Amino acid sequence: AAKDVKFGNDARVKMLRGVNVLADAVKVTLGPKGRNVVLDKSFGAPTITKDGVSVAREIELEDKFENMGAQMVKEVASKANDAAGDGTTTATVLAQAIITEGLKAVAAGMNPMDLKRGIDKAVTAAVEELKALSVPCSDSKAIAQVGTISANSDETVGKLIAEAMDKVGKEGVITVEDGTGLQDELDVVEGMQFDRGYLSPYFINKPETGAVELESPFILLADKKISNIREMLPVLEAVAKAGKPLLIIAEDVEGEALATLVVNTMRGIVKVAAVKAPGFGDRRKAMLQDIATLTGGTVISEEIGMELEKATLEDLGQAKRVVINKDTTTIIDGVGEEAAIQGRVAQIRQQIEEATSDYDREKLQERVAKLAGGVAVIKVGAATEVEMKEKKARVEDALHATRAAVEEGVVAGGGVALIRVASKLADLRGQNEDQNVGIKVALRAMEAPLRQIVLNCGEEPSVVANTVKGGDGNYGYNAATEEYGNMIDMGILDPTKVTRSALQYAASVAGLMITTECMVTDLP
C-alpha cells in the first residue's frame, strides 16, 4: 500500500483542523446548559444529544491526517475517562486549547521542544495545586455526600454507596443489578473480581456499557491455552442444551477457537464469552483454584492428565451473575459450598505463616481478601421499568465518582478548580523565553472549560472568568443557577482524579503533536 507522507508544518496543520473539528463538535455540549448536536442514524429519525461522549464517538473525517488529528485526541480523552470515570469532553476541550496555541507558536518560529517543556511544567505545577485545593473524602458522611451529589441530589443513592463501602471496604468489589421490587437492596455475597478483560469486543451484549452481562452461567476453568475449538465440543454442547451462557477462564484463547466463539455468539446459537486467567506463572495455579473453590467448579489442569474433551457440566463452576468489560471480570454469587470456601481460606491463612517475603505475605493476603472478602451487590428498586434502568444508571455513575473521590478527593466542578490553579501559578517561569510561552499557553488553556460552560449558557465568559479568578479556594460560578459561591457547598464538584487525568491527558497529546514532524497514511 503506497502511502502519503506529510512533513512538519503540513503534517501539523492537517492535525490541527482534525482536532478542531472534534473539539468544536464536542465542546458545545460541556455545561449543565449545553447545546445539542444532531447525529444522523442510517434508518429512522436522527439523534439529538447533548452528550459529548456520544458526539465524539461519531467523529471521523474524510481527509486522513485531519482524521488522524481527531482520532488522536479522541484516543487520549477516552483514556482519561477510562482511568477517572469522566472528563472525556473536558480532556478534549483542554486538548484543543493547548494544541491551538502551542501549534501557532511552533508555526511562528519558536522551539517545539521548549514549548512542550513549558506546558509540561505548568501541568506538573497545577497538578500539585489541585492536590492542595482538593478536599478529602474519607468518612461515611463524605462518601454519601459525593455519592448523592454525583447522583443528582438523590440522597438514597449516596446512602447505598456509603453502606456498600461500609460493608466490603473502600476497596471491596461493589456491583449493580436490576431491582426485583420497588425496594433497594444491599447484599454481600461470595464472589470476586479480577483485573482481566474480554478477549473480544463482539462479546458485549450491553452496547451502552461496553460490557458483557451473563445470566447465571456455567464457568469453565481450564489451565492450558485454548487454541483449537475441538476440546470444546463436549462442554459447549452440554451448555447449549442446558440453555445457559458459559464463561471461560484459561491461559488464553487463540484465534482458531476465539474467532469461532466470536461468530458463534454475534448472531449464533450458544452465547458465550472468555477472558484470560488472573496472574502469571506460579501465581495463576492457586489463583485459578480460588475461583474454582468459589464457584464449586473443577480446574482442568494439563499437568494432571485431564483434557477439555474429558469434561462435563459437573466440572464447570457456577455464579448467579458475571460482568466483563474492557479490562475487568467480576463474578457474583458463587455456588461453591460454604464449608469449601471457608476451608480454602483456612488453608491460605495458614500459608501466610511462611512470611519468607513481604511480597509473598502481601500476595497471599490479596488472595484471602478476594475470596473471603466477597462482592457487595446493589439492587436498584424503582416504580416503573424506565425509572428503574435510569436510576440504575445514576447509581453506576455515582459509584464511579465516589471510588474516585475516595482515592484523591474532590474539587470545584465548574471548570473552577482549573481556573483557580491557573491564577495561582501565574508567575511560573522556565529558562527559554520559549518555555515561558509554553507555560502561558498551558495556563491559559486551563480557563477553557469554564469559559466554555459559560459560553454554552449564553453568558459572557471573560466576565464570569474574571470574577471566579477574583476569589479563592472553591469559590466559583454555578452555570446552572447563575450564582457565585463555594462550588462544593453548592454541590458542583469533580473528583480530583478526573480533573487531573483530564488535564494530564490533554497535555500529553498536545505535547505529542507539538513535537510531531512526520505523518504517514494510505493514499486517498
Instruction: Please give the residues from 225 up to 244 whose contact with its own copies meets the rule CB under 8 A.
Output: 227-228, 230-231, 243
Selected from 180, 207, 305, 339, the binder of its own copies by CB under 8 A is 180
**Beta carbon nearer to its own copies, 279 or 485:** 279
479 annotated ligand-binding residue: yes
Q: Does 517 bind its own copies (CB under 8 A)?
A: yes
448 binding its own copies? (CB under 8 A): no
- Contact in structure between 329 and 322 (CB atoms under 8 Å): yes
Distance CA 326, CA 247 (A): 15
Residue 523 CA: distances (Å) to CA of 5, 8, 59, 351, 446? 9, 19, 20, 61, 37
State yes or no: 31 annotated in a binding site. yes
* 109 annotated to a ligand binding site: no
- Of the pair 355, 518, the CB lying nearest its own copies is at 518
Neighbours of 127 (CB within 10 A): 17
Total residues in contact with Mg ion, by rule CB under 5 A: 1
Residue 414 annotated as part of some ligand binding site: yes
Measure the CA–CA gap between 431 and 118, rounded to whole angstroms: 9
Cα separation, 170 vs 369, whole angstroms:
13
Site residues for its own copies, window 351-390 (CB under 8 A)?
A: 359, 383, 385, 388
The window from 89-97, 221-229, 290-298, 393-401 that contacts its own copies (CB under 8 A) reads: 221-229
Partner touching 281 among Mg ion, its own copies, none, CB below 5 to 8 Å by kind? its own copies
Shortest distance, CB of residue 99 to Mg ion, whole angstroms? 21
Cα torsion at 383, 388, 390, 391 (round to 10°)? 80
Q: Is 158 annotated as a binding residue?
A: no
Judged by CB under 8 A, the chain residues 282 through 321 that form the site for its own copies are 282, 307
Helix, strand or coil for residue 244?
coil
Residue 194's DSSP bridge partners are 329
Q: Looking at 227-334, which runs of residues are DSSP E strands?
A: 246-250, 252-253, 273-276, 299-300, 317-325, 328-334
In the complex with its own copies, the residue whose CB is nearer, 3 or 429, is 3
Q: Which is nearer to its own copies, 261 or 406 (CB)?
A: 261
How far is the C-alpha of 308 from the C-alpha of 322, rounded, in Å?
22
523 binds, among Mg ion, its own copies, none (CB under 5 to 8 A by kind): its own copies
Which DSSP string corresponds to 469-490? HTS-TTEEEETTTTEEEETTTT
Cβ at position 146, least distance to Mg ion in Å:
10
Contact status, residue 90 vs residue 81, Cβ threshold 8 Å: no
Unique residue bearing C-alpha cell 482458531: 256
64 makes contact with its own copies (CB under 8 A): yes
The site that binds its own copies (CB under 8 A) totals a number of residues, namely: 91
Q: Convert residues 98-137 into a mask of x (bound to its own copies by CB under 8 A) and - (unbound).
A: --x--xxx-xxxxxxxx-----------------------
Among 18, 21, 27, 86, binds Mg ion (CB under 5 A): 86
- Tell me whether residue 14 or residue 497 sits nearer to its own copies (CB atom): 14
DSSP, res 65: T
- Helix 282-295 and helix 358-373: axis angle, to 10°? 20
When CB distances are held under 5 to 8 angstroms depending on the partner's kind, the choice from Mg ion, its own copies, none that residue 86 binds is Mg ion
| In the complex, least distance from residue 150 CB atom to Mg ion, rounded to whole angstroms | 5
In contact, 134 and 413? CB cutoff 8 Å: no
Which positions from 242 to 271 touch its own copies by CB under 8 A, shown as an x/- string? -x-----------xx--x-------xxx-x
317 bridge partner residues? 219
Binding site for Mg ion (CB under 5 A): 86
